[PDB]
Short mmCIF file of N, CA and C in Angstrom, two decimals:
data_model
loop_
_atom_site.label_atom_id
_atom_site.label_comp_id
_atom_site.label_asym_id
_atom_site.label_seq_id
_atom_site.Cartn_x
_atom_site.Cartn_y
_atom_site.Cartn_z
N UNK A 5 26.43 15.67 89.32
CA UNK A 5 25.30 14.85 89.87
C UNK A 5 24.62 14.01 88.78
N UNK A 6 24.76 12.67 88.90
CA UNK A 6 24.41 11.82 87.81
C UNK A 6 23.58 10.63 88.30
N UNK A 7 22.81 10.10 87.36
CA UNK A 7 22.11 8.83 87.55
C UNK A 7 22.72 7.78 86.63
N UNK A 8 23.21 6.69 87.20
CA UNK A 8 23.83 5.59 86.50
C UNK A 8 22.94 4.35 86.62
N UNK A 9 22.53 3.79 85.46
CA UNK A 9 21.74 2.57 85.41
C UNK A 9 22.58 1.45 84.84
N UNK A 10 22.71 0.38 85.62
CA UNK A 10 23.49 -0.79 85.26
C UNK A 10 22.60 -2.01 85.10
N UNK A 11 23.00 -2.93 84.21
CA UNK A 11 22.44 -4.29 84.26
C UNK A 11 23.47 -5.20 84.87
N UNK A 12 23.10 -5.92 85.92
CA UNK A 12 24.05 -6.69 86.72
C UNK A 12 23.45 -8.09 86.77
N UNK A 13 23.80 -8.96 85.80
CA UNK A 13 23.05 -10.21 85.66
C UNK A 13 23.28 -11.22 86.76
N UNK A 14 24.29 -11.03 87.60
CA UNK A 14 24.49 -11.91 88.73
C UNK A 14 23.49 -11.65 89.85
N UNK A 15 22.72 -10.55 89.80
CA UNK A 15 21.75 -10.35 90.86
C UNK A 15 20.53 -11.24 90.56
N UNK A 16 20.43 -12.36 91.29
CA UNK A 16 19.31 -13.29 91.12
C UNK A 16 18.53 -13.55 92.39
N UNK A 17 19.03 -13.03 93.51
CA UNK A 17 18.35 -13.24 94.78
C UNK A 17 18.86 -12.19 95.76
N UNK A 18 18.49 -12.31 97.05
CA UNK A 18 18.82 -11.24 97.98
C UNK A 18 20.30 -11.24 98.26
N UNK A 19 20.91 -12.42 98.38
CA UNK A 19 22.31 -12.48 98.68
C UNK A 19 23.17 -11.87 97.56
N UNK A 20 22.86 -12.20 96.31
CA UNK A 20 23.67 -11.69 95.20
C UNK A 20 23.40 -10.22 94.90
N UNK A 21 22.18 -9.73 95.15
CA UNK A 21 21.90 -8.30 95.13
C UNK A 21 22.78 -7.54 96.13
N UNK A 22 22.88 -8.10 97.34
CA UNK A 22 23.67 -7.47 98.39
C UNK A 22 25.16 -7.49 98.06
N UNK A 23 25.65 -8.60 97.51
CA UNK A 23 27.05 -8.67 97.10
C UNK A 23 27.37 -7.58 96.08
N UNK A 24 26.48 -7.42 95.09
CA UNK A 24 26.69 -6.41 94.06
C UNK A 24 26.75 -5.02 94.67
N UNK A 25 25.79 -4.70 95.56
CA UNK A 25 25.78 -3.40 96.20
C UNK A 25 27.03 -3.18 97.03
N UNK A 26 27.48 -4.22 97.73
CA UNK A 26 28.67 -4.09 98.58
C UNK A 26 29.91 -3.74 97.76
N UNK A 27 30.00 -4.21 96.51
CA UNK A 27 31.15 -3.92 95.69
C UNK A 27 31.25 -2.43 95.35
N UNK A 28 30.13 -1.71 95.35
CA UNK A 28 30.15 -0.32 94.96
C UNK A 28 29.93 0.57 96.18
N UNK A 29 29.57 0.03 97.36
CA UNK A 29 29.07 0.95 98.41
C UNK A 29 30.14 1.85 99.06
N UNK A 30 31.41 1.61 98.79
CA UNK A 30 32.46 2.49 99.28
C UNK A 30 32.97 3.52 98.31
N UNK A 31 32.39 3.58 97.14
CA UNK A 31 32.78 4.55 96.15
C UNK A 31 32.36 5.92 96.61
N UNK A 32 33.32 6.85 96.64
CA UNK A 32 33.03 8.24 97.02
C UNK A 32 32.01 8.90 96.11
N UNK A 33 31.10 9.60 96.74
CA UNK A 33 30.10 10.48 96.19
C UNK A 33 28.75 9.81 95.85
N UNK A 34 28.57 8.56 96.24
CA UNK A 34 27.26 7.89 96.07
C UNK A 34 26.27 8.40 97.12
N UNK A 35 25.09 8.76 96.66
CA UNK A 35 24.01 9.10 97.53
C UNK A 35 23.00 7.97 97.67
N UNK A 36 22.72 7.21 96.59
CA UNK A 36 21.79 6.09 96.70
C UNK A 36 22.15 5.00 95.70
N UNK A 37 21.84 3.78 96.12
CA UNK A 37 22.04 2.60 95.29
C UNK A 37 20.80 1.74 95.39
N UNK A 38 20.03 1.62 94.30
CA UNK A 38 18.86 0.80 94.25
C UNK A 38 19.19 -0.44 93.45
N UNK A 39 18.55 -1.53 93.81
CA UNK A 39 18.72 -2.75 93.03
C UNK A 39 17.42 -3.50 92.93
N UNK A 40 17.11 -3.98 91.74
CA UNK A 40 15.87 -4.70 91.52
C UNK A 40 16.16 -6.00 90.78
N UNK A 41 15.62 -7.09 91.31
CA UNK A 41 15.83 -8.39 90.71
C UNK A 41 15.13 -8.43 89.37
N UNK A 42 14.06 -7.65 89.27
CA UNK A 42 13.16 -7.74 88.14
C UNK A 42 13.91 -7.71 86.81
N UNK A 43 14.65 -6.62 86.51
CA UNK A 43 15.42 -6.53 85.27
C UNK A 43 16.91 -6.45 85.59
N UNK A 44 17.32 -7.05 86.70
CA UNK A 44 18.71 -7.12 87.13
C UNK A 44 19.32 -5.71 87.13
N UNK A 45 18.47 -4.72 87.47
CA UNK A 45 18.81 -3.31 87.36
C UNK A 45 19.38 -2.73 88.65
N UNK A 46 20.53 -2.09 88.54
CA UNK A 46 21.11 -1.33 89.65
C UNK A 46 21.16 0.12 89.24
N UNK A 47 20.67 1.00 90.11
CA UNK A 47 20.62 2.41 89.84
C UNK A 47 21.42 3.15 90.91
N UNK A 48 22.43 3.92 90.47
CA UNK A 48 23.31 4.63 91.39
C UNK A 48 23.18 6.12 91.11
N UNK A 49 22.89 6.91 92.16
CA UNK A 49 22.77 8.33 92.01
C UNK A 49 23.74 9.06 92.92
N UNK A 50 24.50 10.02 92.39
CA UNK A 50 25.48 10.69 93.19
C UNK A 50 26.38 11.54 92.30
N UNK A 51 27.47 11.96 92.89
CA UNK A 51 28.48 12.68 92.09
C UNK A 51 29.78 11.90 92.08
N UNK A 52 29.65 10.57 92.09
CA UNK A 52 30.69 9.59 92.04
C UNK A 52 31.20 9.46 90.61
N UNK A 53 32.27 8.71 90.50
CA UNK A 53 32.92 8.48 89.21
C UNK A 53 32.44 7.16 88.63
N UNK A 54 31.68 7.23 87.53
CA UNK A 54 31.13 6.05 86.93
C UNK A 54 32.23 5.08 86.53
N UNK A 55 33.42 5.60 86.14
CA UNK A 55 34.47 4.66 85.79
C UNK A 55 34.85 3.75 86.96
N UNK A 56 34.86 4.31 88.19
CA UNK A 56 35.12 3.48 89.37
C UNK A 56 34.01 2.42 89.58
N UNK A 57 32.75 2.83 89.33
CA UNK A 57 31.62 1.92 89.47
C UNK A 57 31.84 0.69 88.57
N UNK A 58 32.19 0.97 87.31
CA UNK A 58 32.40 -0.10 86.33
C UNK A 58 33.56 -1.01 86.76
N UNK A 59 34.67 -0.36 87.19
CA UNK A 59 35.85 -1.09 87.61
C UNK A 59 35.50 -2.03 88.76
N UNK A 60 34.82 -1.50 89.78
CA UNK A 60 34.52 -2.33 90.93
C UNK A 60 33.53 -3.44 90.59
N UNK A 61 32.57 -3.23 89.70
CA UNK A 61 31.62 -4.31 89.47
C UNK A 61 32.15 -5.42 88.56
N UNK A 62 33.28 -5.22 87.89
CA UNK A 62 33.74 -6.24 86.95
C UNK A 62 34.21 -7.50 87.68
N UNK A 63 34.60 -7.35 88.94
CA UNK A 63 35.05 -8.46 89.76
C UNK A 63 33.85 -9.34 90.12
N UNK A 64 32.66 -8.77 90.09
CA UNK A 64 31.42 -9.48 90.35
C UNK A 64 31.05 -10.34 89.14
N UNK A 65 31.08 -9.74 87.95
CA UNK A 65 30.52 -10.42 86.80
C UNK A 65 30.50 -9.47 85.62
N UNK A 66 29.71 -9.82 84.61
CA UNK A 66 29.65 -9.05 83.38
C UNK A 66 28.48 -8.09 83.47
N UNK A 67 28.79 -6.83 83.61
CA UNK A 67 27.75 -5.84 83.81
C UNK A 67 27.68 -5.00 82.56
N UNK A 68 26.50 -4.42 82.30
CA UNK A 68 26.33 -3.45 81.22
C UNK A 68 25.99 -2.08 81.80
N UNK A 69 26.60 -1.03 81.22
CA UNK A 69 26.14 0.32 81.50
C UNK A 69 24.96 0.59 80.60
N UNK A 70 23.76 0.79 81.16
CA UNK A 70 22.58 1.08 80.40
C UNK A 70 22.49 2.56 80.09
N UNK A 71 22.63 3.42 81.09
CA UNK A 71 22.55 4.84 80.92
C UNK A 71 23.40 5.55 81.98
N UNK A 72 23.89 6.69 81.58
CA UNK A 72 24.50 7.66 82.44
C UNK A 72 23.96 9.02 81.99
N UNK A 73 23.38 9.77 82.92
CA UNK A 73 22.87 11.07 82.58
C UNK A 73 22.66 11.94 83.81
N UNK A 74 22.21 13.20 83.66
CA UNK A 74 21.85 14.01 84.80
C UNK A 74 20.86 13.27 85.66
N UNK A 75 21.02 13.48 86.97
CA UNK A 75 20.08 12.97 87.96
C UNK A 75 18.70 13.65 87.82
N UNK B 6 30.80 1.56 111.98
CA UNK B 6 29.68 2.50 112.12
C UNK B 6 29.10 2.90 110.76
N UNK B 7 27.83 3.32 110.78
CA UNK B 7 27.01 3.22 109.56
C UNK B 7 27.28 4.38 108.62
N UNK B 8 27.12 4.10 107.29
CA UNK B 8 27.19 5.14 106.27
C UNK B 8 25.87 5.30 105.48
N UNK B 9 25.06 4.24 105.50
CA UNK B 9 23.79 4.17 104.77
C UNK B 9 22.68 3.69 105.68
N UNK B 10 21.48 4.09 105.29
CA UNK B 10 20.29 3.36 105.73
C UNK B 10 19.87 2.49 104.56
N UNK B 11 19.57 1.26 104.90
CA UNK B 11 19.16 0.25 103.96
C UNK B 11 17.69 -0.02 104.14
N UNK B 12 16.94 0.18 103.06
CA UNK B 12 15.50 0.03 103.07
C UNK B 12 15.03 -1.26 102.42
N UNK B 13 14.04 -1.89 103.04
CA UNK B 13 13.48 -3.15 102.63
C UNK B 13 11.97 -3.10 102.61
N UNK B 14 11.39 -3.86 101.69
CA UNK B 14 10.01 -4.28 101.72
C UNK B 14 9.90 -5.55 102.55
N UNK B 15 9.56 -5.38 103.82
CA UNK B 15 9.44 -6.49 104.75
C UNK B 15 10.42 -6.31 105.90
N UNK B 16 10.05 -6.80 107.10
CA UNK B 16 10.93 -6.70 108.27
C UNK B 16 11.58 -8.02 108.67
N UNK B 17 11.12 -9.13 108.10
CA UNK B 17 11.67 -10.44 108.51
C UNK B 17 12.84 -10.79 107.62
N UNK B 18 14.03 -11.03 108.20
CA UNK B 18 15.23 -11.22 107.41
C UNK B 18 15.07 -12.34 106.39
N UNK B 19 14.27 -13.36 106.73
CA UNK B 19 14.12 -14.50 105.83
C UNK B 19 13.40 -14.15 104.54
N UNK B 20 12.49 -13.17 104.53
CA UNK B 20 11.61 -12.96 103.40
C UNK B 20 11.74 -11.52 102.84
N UNK B 21 12.40 -10.59 103.55
CA UNK B 21 12.37 -9.17 103.15
C UNK B 21 13.13 -9.02 101.84
N UNK B 22 12.73 -7.99 101.12
CA UNK B 22 13.32 -7.66 99.83
C UNK B 22 14.03 -6.32 99.93
N UNK B 23 15.33 -6.32 99.70
CA UNK B 23 16.11 -5.10 99.76
C UNK B 23 15.74 -4.17 98.61
N UNK B 24 15.53 -2.90 98.94
CA UNK B 24 15.09 -1.92 97.98
C UNK B 24 16.24 -0.99 97.59
N UNK B 25 16.90 -0.38 98.58
CA UNK B 25 17.79 0.72 98.29
C UNK B 25 18.69 1.02 99.49
N UNK B 26 19.91 1.42 99.19
CA UNK B 26 20.79 2.01 100.17
C UNK B 26 20.73 3.50 99.97
N UNK B 27 20.63 4.27 101.05
CA UNK B 27 20.53 5.71 101.02
C UNK B 27 21.56 6.28 101.97
N UNK B 28 22.46 7.10 101.41
CA UNK B 28 23.51 7.68 102.24
C UNK B 28 22.94 8.51 103.40
N UNK B 29 23.46 8.24 104.62
CA UNK B 29 22.98 9.00 105.76
C UNK B 29 23.22 10.49 105.53
N UNK B 30 22.19 11.30 105.77
CA UNK B 30 22.21 12.72 105.52
C UNK B 30 21.60 13.12 104.17
N UNK B 31 21.08 12.16 103.41
CA UNK B 31 20.39 12.43 102.16
C UNK B 31 18.98 11.88 102.13
N UNK B 32 18.21 12.32 101.11
CA UNK B 32 16.89 11.86 100.84
C UNK B 32 16.91 11.13 99.48
N UNK B 33 15.99 10.22 99.31
CA UNK B 33 15.91 9.41 98.08
C UNK B 33 14.48 8.94 97.87
N UNK B 34 14.13 8.65 96.61
CA UNK B 34 12.78 8.26 96.34
C UNK B 34 12.83 6.78 96.00
N UNK B 35 12.10 6.01 96.77
CA UNK B 35 11.96 4.59 96.56
C UNK B 35 10.69 4.31 95.78
N UNK B 36 10.74 3.39 94.79
CA UNK B 36 9.54 2.96 94.11
C UNK B 36 9.28 1.52 94.52
N UNK B 37 8.13 1.28 95.10
CA UNK B 37 7.76 -0.05 95.59
C UNK B 37 6.26 -0.11 95.64
N UNK B 38 5.75 -1.31 95.32
CA UNK B 38 4.33 -1.57 95.32
C UNK B 38 3.51 -0.56 94.50
N UNK B 39 4.12 -0.07 93.43
CA UNK B 39 3.37 0.78 92.52
C UNK B 39 3.34 2.24 92.94
N UNK B 40 4.11 2.62 93.97
CA UNK B 40 4.04 3.97 94.48
C UNK B 40 5.46 4.43 94.80
N UNK B 41 5.59 5.74 94.99
CA UNK B 41 6.82 6.41 95.34
C UNK B 41 6.82 6.85 96.79
N UNK B 42 7.95 6.58 97.46
CA UNK B 42 8.13 6.99 98.84
C UNK B 42 9.44 7.69 98.97
N UNK B 43 9.39 8.94 99.38
CA UNK B 43 10.56 9.75 99.55
C UNK B 43 10.99 9.75 101.02
N UNK B 44 12.13 9.07 101.26
CA UNK B 44 12.65 8.84 102.61
C UNK B 44 13.82 9.75 102.87
N UNK B 45 13.99 10.10 104.15
CA UNK B 45 15.14 10.81 104.65
C UNK B 45 15.96 9.87 105.55
N UNK B 46 17.20 9.59 105.16
CA UNK B 46 18.12 8.79 105.93
C UNK B 46 18.80 9.73 106.91
N UNK B 47 18.16 9.95 108.04
CA UNK B 47 18.55 11.01 108.94
C UNK B 47 19.84 10.77 109.70
N UNK B 48 20.05 9.59 110.27
CA UNK B 48 21.14 9.27 111.16
C UNK B 48 21.25 7.79 111.25
N UNK B 49 22.19 7.33 112.09
CA UNK B 49 22.51 5.93 112.18
C UNK B 49 21.41 5.09 112.83
N UNK B 50 20.38 5.71 113.38
CA UNK B 50 19.23 4.94 113.88
C UNK B 50 18.33 4.46 112.73
N UNK B 51 18.39 5.16 111.59
CA UNK B 51 17.68 4.69 110.40
C UNK B 51 16.19 4.46 110.69
N UNK B 52 15.57 5.39 111.40
CA UNK B 52 14.13 5.40 111.47
C UNK B 52 13.58 5.62 110.07
N UNK B 53 12.44 5.04 109.80
CA UNK B 53 11.80 5.18 108.49
C UNK B 53 10.97 6.46 108.51
N UNK B 54 11.42 7.41 107.71
CA UNK B 54 10.90 8.78 107.75
C UNK B 54 10.52 9.24 106.35
N UNK B 55 9.26 9.57 106.15
CA UNK B 55 8.85 10.14 104.86
C UNK B 55 9.03 11.64 104.93
N UNK B 56 9.46 12.24 103.82
CA UNK B 56 9.71 13.67 103.79
C UNK B 56 8.43 14.51 103.95
N UNK B 57 7.26 13.95 103.81
CA UNK B 57 6.03 14.69 104.06
C UNK B 57 5.62 14.65 105.52
N UNK B 58 6.40 13.99 106.35
CA UNK B 58 6.14 13.88 107.77
C UNK B 58 5.02 12.88 108.07
N UNK B 59 4.49 12.20 107.10
CA UNK B 59 3.46 11.20 107.33
C UNK B 59 4.09 9.86 107.68
N UNK B 60 3.20 9.01 108.26
CA UNK B 60 3.58 7.66 108.61
C UNK B 60 3.93 6.91 107.35
N UNK B 61 5.10 6.28 107.29
CA UNK B 61 5.44 5.41 106.18
C UNK B 61 4.57 4.16 106.21
N UNK B 62 4.38 3.40 105.12
CA UNK B 62 3.67 2.13 105.14
C UNK B 62 4.36 1.16 106.09
N UNK B 63 3.57 0.34 106.79
CA UNK B 63 4.18 -0.44 107.85
C UNK B 63 5.18 -1.44 107.32
N UNK B 64 5.06 -1.87 106.06
CA UNK B 64 5.96 -2.85 105.50
C UNK B 64 7.37 -2.33 105.20
N UNK B 65 7.52 -1.01 105.16
CA UNK B 65 8.81 -0.41 104.83
C UNK B 65 9.69 -0.45 106.09
N UNK B 66 10.84 -1.10 105.97
CA UNK B 66 11.79 -1.29 107.05
C UNK B 66 13.12 -0.68 106.67
N UNK B 67 13.92 -0.32 107.67
CA UNK B 67 15.25 0.17 107.43
C UNK B 67 16.19 -0.33 108.51
N UNK B 68 17.44 -0.48 108.10
CA UNK B 68 18.53 -0.91 108.97
C UNK B 68 19.75 -0.13 108.53
N UNK B 69 20.59 0.28 109.46
CA UNK B 69 21.86 0.90 109.10
C UNK B 69 22.84 -0.13 108.53
N UNK B 70 23.75 0.38 107.70
CA UNK B 70 24.87 -0.39 107.16
C UNK B 70 26.10 0.54 107.10
#
């Protein structure tokens, strides 16, 4: 059970926030996905595989893994 | 058919701000407007439900996805 914080610089409005979330929303073991335009921050909590998260978001754009740790 | 409840600040599609996707059958804490709201994504109807059983703020909206 982990909390993953990403920077997803393509999130600049509601449409691009939703696109980013859609790229990860089928990953097994996600419980929640938050996204904030403020610091282009996406927060994923679950027992999913962070490597899959990274793989799926690369098709969107250049993302950074900020943190991975216990939820 | 739905897997998440999607929570927004605002109910009008033109202006609402998406906050969080919450897997149906789980609870999650949303931070909005300077406060924390712990919601339960109960089922595909995605009623807005606070875990304390109190009325959620009227601006908090949810839709299934």
